[PDB]
Amino acid sequence: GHMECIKGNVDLVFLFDGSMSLQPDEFQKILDFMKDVMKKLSNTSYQFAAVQFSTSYKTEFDFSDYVKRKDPDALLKHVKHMLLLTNTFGAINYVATEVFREELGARPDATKVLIIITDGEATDSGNIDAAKDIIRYIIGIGKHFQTKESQETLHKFASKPASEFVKILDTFEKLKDLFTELQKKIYV
Ligand SMILES: [Mg+2]
């Protein structure tokens, strides 16, 4: 029950896949999921940042942007789908070093949470030692995670145990349902 153990201030980053496999409506459903989560946790001790990744990495908004403009529709208005590869290792290192920074609104007393949303196996390699103080929850969606073997490639990015921190969805429509399952775990 590690998700139920989180208490107090939480700095949560969405790391979302903008790879070439995604159809326009699928990309939009990822955006809507992030908006739904932010709206439901509005006015709690949560604050949010969001990073799109594909071949390279872009901070769509920093924690300090969220604090000023606490409006999910406005914060994500300008997102452009990158349509390239899936460099997940680099992306996690980007979040750990470029996003969780006090200069950008990160709080020193906040538990660090990373929700990763992806529709494919990573196209890079490396390590994520830099993320060892981040709780990592990964959502893998769609046909590229049909096989058990592909599902297990995500375990190396997630916190342990995989049974808690790796969620496989067969379609993008299940994101709405996942949202509901997650609210019951998160204490506010
Ligand atoms: Mg993909």
Swiss-Prot record:
Description of post-translational modifications: In resting T-cells, up to 40% of surface ITGAL is constitutively phosphorylated. Phosphorylation causes conformational changes needed for ligand binding and is necessary for activation by some physiological agents.
Coiled coil spans: none
Domain VWFA: 11-182
Functional description taken from the UniProt entry: Integrin ITGAL/ITGB2 is a receptor for ICAM1, ICAM2, ICAM3 and ICAM4. Integrin ITGAL/ITGB2 is a receptor for F11R. Integrin ITGAL/ITGB2 is a receptor for the secreted form of ubiquitin-like protein ISG15; the interaction is mediated by ITGAL. Involved in a variety of immune phenomena including leukocyte-endothelial cell interaction, cytotoxic T-cell mediated killing, and antibody dependent killing by granulocytes and monocytes. Contributes to natural killer cell cytotoxicity. Involved in leukocyte adhesion and transmigration of leukocytes including T-cells and neutrophils.
Quaternary context: Heterodimer of an alpha and a beta subunit. The ITGAL alpha subunit associates with the ITGB2 beta subunit. Interacts with THBD. Interacts with CD226. (Microbial infection) Interacts with SARS-CoV Orf7a protein.
Domain comment as written in the entry: The integrin I-domain (insert) is a VWFA domain. Integrins with I-domains do not undergo protease cleavage. The I-domain is necessary and sufficient for interaction with ICAM1 and F11R.
Protein's recorded name: Integrin alpha-L
Residues included from the entire protein: 149 to 333 of 1170
